[model samples]
Target: RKQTITIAGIEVEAEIEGPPGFVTHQRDKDRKISNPTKPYQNHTVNKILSVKVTDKLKEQVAKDALSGGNGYDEGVGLFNNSIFNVFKEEFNSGKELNDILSSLESVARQNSGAFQNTLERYKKMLDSNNVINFLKSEAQKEYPKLKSKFQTKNQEYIWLIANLDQSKFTKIASTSEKYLEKGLTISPRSAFINEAGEIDSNGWGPPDEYNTVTSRLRRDNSEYRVFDYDEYYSRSSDRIANGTYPGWVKEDVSEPYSKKYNFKASDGIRFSKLERINPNPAKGKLNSGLVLDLDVSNDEAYRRSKELIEKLQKDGEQITSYRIKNMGEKNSDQAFKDILGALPKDIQQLELFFSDKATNTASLIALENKNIKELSLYTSGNSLKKAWSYNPLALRNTTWINTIDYNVSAEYSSHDKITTRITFNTLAFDQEDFSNGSYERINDGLRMVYYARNNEPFFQGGHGPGLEPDKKLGQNSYPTGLDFSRVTGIKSLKGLRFDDDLDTSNEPRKITELTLYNNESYFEISSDELNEANLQHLSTGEGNPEKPKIHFSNGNNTTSIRISGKTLLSDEGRRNLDKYFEYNESLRNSGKQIQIPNGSDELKKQLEGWGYKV
Candidate 1:
């Protein structure tokens, strides 16, 4: 039967079946209550009625399952069929059909105890050897070529330990009962787990930590322990070289009496002698092992005799050699008699001084036959003038002659007698050039040139001669006209090249290239004007009037130009538009030349055709 129940003031209908005496009461319009008592309470009567009612419900549900039914009666039939279908489907399905379930709740609940027991059994299976071997295998697989390269057994272990992640391997070893029992090994005293379930390596000894062993092995085998050359020599080889052992000494073999003997007095005397001894005996030795053969007839013999005297004098002693071989009877007549009268018969040593003018031809020739080993000469006034005037070479045959501020002059001819000249005055031969014009002539062919003054403010302020009329003799003064052709050798004209003071009256002479050093304003020549126009008219070329090239050193200033009568706005625009040519000939003529390589001929030809005149 269909009945209504009221919940939260809302009406809900329900269908229920029971015995014949089962009573239904409506407390409200939507709410109903059931009472099974009195005559309906009999077991046999209830059972028969229940069976009849179930058969009626089954028939109604079968009809409703086939046809779409509605209302309370239809809902009751549908609910009955849903319950029956669930039980029927369970009974008909096999184990495989049920095992292919989308939910794990049933399986997990059924084997919960077994799963817990399996986890405990696996935990005990891990052992140290098994874990280490597994790690080694994994390392080899990952780095196949690494094993052959590391030769030693320890090195192989080190390589495995370096590569393996210990924590990950430990977890893997703890996975099953077999792995846990055979592979895992933990030190008994080690902190297996912290409060947070992390292994604490520091709580155990170094043997329990894999990193500690690897780190120590690395430190022991590191390149840091290798010996260096300096350290090896200083600590080992140097001690051996110095006659000492690196370790402890064994014994002293000296006699007891010798050891007890004192040498204090002898040591004091020896120390005093050390101060007087010549440390550098090579330079200070009294007898040097140098031998010279002296014949007094040969030129070398005479030279050595002179050298000996000089050595003696240098050592503050007076010494000489008296030896003569080639003496003519005529040379002994007039001059030799006078010389013999002046000198001692056995003249071994003599000292004499010659004044500035005394070293004349006659005096020098007279001393040649005297067998004099050494002679000295000195000058008071200009020594060069005296030496040039006198025949000083007559004394060249003399063994030795020290000339002090002496001057001599002589003229000699093979066919004629020697003529000698002597000058006592030093200032008689001072020379100077006397060319008088815009440029001051210094040397015979050299002239000191200067730039002229013009409207340019930078050009006008020269302390040179042209700017200041009184200081005109100096290089600072300006020239009336400049001939650059004559000033060829100077690399830079030292402020003479620029028209810092632009003078219109001064015309260019033989000036093929004009360089403006400081002013950027003059560099503003139009490319149009320079390209088609002839600068030859401004040049001082012989017949060809064109000035082929002009260079401007603007010194980082922004410069511009115009081409073909059109103004180029900036320096960049001018370079891009106007064809640039090499300034070689100009640089060469200006004495700032550079050699061009063989392959640069094309570039040179292009520049020349473009009016560069290289």
Candidate 2:
């Protein structure tokens, strides 16, 4: 009988019966061939022949090699001896082989103990959990001091310690106190003042001492003569009349020349005596009889005095000459016309006044054709009022007029007839009140109308609304009773209105049909599976592979089982079966499947029969 074992789908056969003692003889032959001298030769021969040769001749040769005498034994022994002798010779030629082997053995022995010691130490380290626990306890005991040291070095650590409520090893007093003591005990002998006005000392001065006291006292006592009137008016007639007063004396005297006694003569001498000495001094007799001769000669004096007076009169006339020259080259009337013409026509009002009548009249006449709305002609105060009154008809189109005095009613009868109307329609005013005629009435028809105040508060009195208006209170005019039910576009127009309580009522649907369409589109699967078992039904129908159409279902769920026509085909069915068998085999190997020992073999055979190997 022949039996075969299949491994990985390849069959190997072995015969059950052949010859008696044949297996024993084969074993002895194998042992003889395995001997170092003959094994290599036997392998070479077997590889070339591709067959086992166990004849009597080969057996006798093997036996002779086993014996100690000549023949096959001598030949094998010689071959082995020659090979080993070559190795020995080569090894000895370089370095002693036995010495190297001995050194290697010594090293191995020495390192063996060290390696074992290291391994034991590691094992003890792994086993002793109490060592780490003890170390942690010791570290915790010293943690406070370490943390305090870190806090003294870093402010961030100080905050950490403060949060932890741990004891800190700190000095009794602050470092600043020691520094202050050192600063206060500085010696004066070690002080110096540098060229930059900096004071360098061993440290600081004594308490309650200042460096600027002496300088302040010297500054307070220093005298400064800021001003002197005598020096200011030294060359003036006032200074000569008062005579010289010392510069220091002027400081004590306020208005020294203004005192009457300062200006009084010493002997109460009259002005006549002073004048008599100096009168006609140019013609005095002591020099050339010029003074006495001038008093006695009236003809010569009168002629000379008249000539002098005429010269003086001519000089005064030249000094006061009043020849009026025009500062501007253009005529005043033309200039005024040009200026008024240059103004933009949008300006509705214009006014011009001048100190000179010629300039004023020219300006007024030039503006006559400029559509002057109002005109006031005035020479003086009441003259303007009388002129307008006399020709009251000329003020027919004028809105206002200015005069020197009280502005009188020029056209008395037409005043009410010409009353202007101005309307005010501001948003600040209550619109309801205004519409209801609650505002003040303008009998003269003059009021201002405004659409909005500060661009806010429209005529309806609130912005587009559901809530109260932003700036006002006590009024609610929100639009009610509005129609909003209309599907004007592809998307439904619903739930646009404000809902008070949708969570509680549940009467109206919050979402529409379009919302459901959007949600469904988001949840749809798009890609197809490569394996037939996981493939979509449409894809499986197209491939047409071979496999069972395995069905799985959750109770009462239509979505639980879905199948496609293409998955039932031959090729795809085979692929699905392969995947199924693979998954089952993995589950069994991992002990996740309950495999009855007898059934496991049957299952494996069944899988093999289906073109699967387990």
Candidate 3:
């Protein structure tokens, strides 16, 4: 049964045994097709034949034989440049000529049935389907070219896969891990181990994803570097440091310590020596030391902070910083005290994000620790979901602090009287009596009144009607008229409705920017007052060049500017209006540009219409 019998001049030989048999062929262009083996009498060989080819007249004879043997040769062995060219022609994929031939020979030598079945299917699907005419005319693409390629392959290497194994590849790479789940399929470009575990073929087996497990191990021997039990669970030097309580002795245990320490109720004294160390942890590297995620609701932050501090205290490491978030009055005092205990020793900065824990404000306990240089507080107005939030200071106990910095609303009764503390409120000149604030605290600091507007009759001491009661959209209320005469501390002012009696006479020389606004009442300041003011960056009447004529004088030249909410132009005001732009030009020449309040060029255009240089 096994002899070098040349069917079509290619070696179509086989040996009959048990389960599997082998066959091979060689194709050489130089070898002439002179003598080719004769075909067996039908069914002569029990084992399927593996046709071998080695060239010229023999190649032509084999070619002629294989043309008809597609139905006969169950196992076909194709050599280099032989069926490889045919494959590029058959399924239109023989582009990589050498590997295809080499792999085919390898698969044929062993899993010849696997290789044979692929070819059978390829021929089966193509031969039975009317794909030639189906692919000829298409709506999607130049699919006619598909038919064109198919037509050219019948006589050429295109028919080479007549015995190709379908398992080696797939139409698309989407095939699952288990390739043999199905019997046979298309072979796209692939390399997989054959079932016999010898040659690498795409014919059948796990796709690349699953194969990587074995592939990776083949290259690297030690993957233990990434996964280590000792490193993750215990101290490296090993002072018996996995710090777990003895397994056998914990007869029973208590609440917090029971869960935390892994202790038996009976073994209370076991970890007595391990007092300074943490017995249980999810993960750790040892006393360098550890980061504790403190739970604020149950005072976990305080306990954890102490744990870290003690470890560092014994091990002698520097405590870098303390970030205390959501600190409230009830639980924060002691924690703040403990944090300050380590101040200046190694602790550099303390950033306290104090929460209005239900409308209660906790000062940093009024701790005046000079050792701690930087302490900061980020405040929010509402802590209890209320409209207003305020901080109550325990500051009476501190000595290093002399000034208070915060924006107080204009609606308080008499403020605190502290001889040592000075409060420079920006919104001055309201209802609060300056007599309550010590003159000791009131050094000659420049003060400002932010229009001191108030809605309640209590904050507004004046008897008559004040600025328009209408609140601007989205605003709750407006500032009441200010009496600057109340406090000589009035160094600067931003006005809305000015009282005709309100002092505009002489303000401090340091008051750099003066803005006059027009409101419910018309304000008229004489040119003599403007001349005496001698201020920089002054904008009059909330600046619209249309409404009110501002007749104000500084010196020999009088300048008048039109602003919002004014219509009456007095003879004196018009005289100043003529020189208004002329005098404003002098300020710009000196590097002082008057800013238009409209935030647009509209004001500039309106001023130009006044026949003045603005």
Candidate 4:
């Protein structure tokens, strides 16, 4: 039930859900990435400058990496792991960032022999290729500054200061470029570094734009493909042929085909080049998708677009979404109606990017795609179309969707935040197209939306061990009308919009089991809010005519519902615990029985007083 607005000749039907810039979404699956938010490869600085980062940040990164967030090669993996490792080495400890260079000046002269030895071996092996000589020469030139800069920043940025490098950082700015190539956002990347120098503000923000590999070499969705040497036999020079030295200096494999995988961008300084090993994701053609200009000069573009979409359908891949932009010329607009009409069922998501004249075109897709859960219709030009409507588009709001985003203006315009209206469906017209555009997917941007709207069973977590659900359910809370409330019933409400006043009355109803766990400064779950949720129901009094189960955990054992540590026994907390049971017992004939932290005598006694047992 969120409202709508238009800008940029587009109709935006959605928003980030919570406060404008707060993190409304996060990709927990990324916990496995070596560094989902790496400060580009800092360990190289550790090796040269003897500077190290803080252990706290390293532990946090390592914890997230175990989640099976996309993994990279050993070459890429080594630096990420080193961040945690270098901190432990006593010898590497205790160096100051500013003095790192002066300290390394003497160290460089003392280690001159080691450097010469590396060059000697490298030179002997690649005497013909000369690649080894180039690396050694390159390594020799900045050993001092790389050493100093690492040392200086290690102290300056603390955790980030130690490992951060200006050279290593600028590489992230390329994301906007990647997005421009595709049809996602219009910007690459930007950072809030101190203006005078190259370091960024400690807050690294989201990793999508920063993790800009655009496409990765994918074999199975499970792992990124890495290169194998072209041959296994006769490898290096005679010294290694004597089976003594290891030619493992570089894993540089068969060229041309594999070269695309060795992505090297100077993260900073000439030495800040970061070589990410997987560069084989898609830029435009996905197995189930295609994009085209509505007013393309070439007829083949339209021809190919139709052919590609049909191929997806014939192969059983449903066309979940389709985006169209044009002058609203009826024939050109009707052309896609054939494609949209041919689709098996309603589209799950649809995007219409055009102006007032294109309303017929936008209207056509909205009408034809009867059951679309998501819509992104916004203008490109700055216009006063304060609001747009999708009321005509909804066929029947099922548990089909729960979000809508239509931003007619870009972020920097000082324009009003998108006031969107998605009655009973979903939306996010962001540069969500990873295959064809430069925008990386932002967080688990879809999971929260789907969980709340569809009430799809949500696996709650992100904090603590990947243990039991800390508590889960439809997320976000908006009184006027949370986008989460649309498109059906919500049974397991994990948690609702934080910091907002209670207003579930306007929300889609029949929602039972309001959860109030994982409380935070911004999270506000009043006792009244819980009671309000249990009472509110926009139901047919349908299936499960059963009143809400109203599950709450003290500790014994109950899935789906539990009390959070946040407001364990606050007035609000106590109120929720008492009335929720009274409310449930009022409906089901038995009061609430919750399992809380076992040894809590205060809570134990409180529950009984409230007509519940611990």
The global C-alpha lDDT for each of the candidates, from Candidate 1 onward, is 0.26, 0.22, 0.28, 0.28
Clashes of each: 43, 33, 39, 70
Compose the digit string of candidate 2's lDDT tens values, residues 441-560: 210001110100111111111122112222121122211111111111211112122221222421111110011011110111111223322231111133545432211111111111
Clashes of 1: 43
Q: Estimate each model's TM-score.
A: 0.13, 0.10, 0.19, 0.23
In the range 568-613, model 1's lDDT, one tens digit per residue, is 2354433322322333232332222111222233222122112122
RMSD to the true structure for each prediction, in A, is 51.9, 56.1, 32.7, 25.4
Q: Please tell me which model should have the higher lDDT, number 2 or number 4.
A: 4
> Worst 10-residue stretch by lDDT in candidate 4?
42-51
- After TM-score superposition, the amount by which residue 41's alpha carbon in candidate 4 deviates from its true location, in angstroms, is 32
Model 2, TM vs. native: 0.10
Best by TM-score, which number?
Answer: 4
Q: What is the C-alpha local distance difference test score of candidate 4? A: 0.28
lDDT of 4 by residue, 166-222 (tens): 232222123322332221221111122222221122122222321212111011111
Choose 2 or 4, whichever is better by TM-score: 4
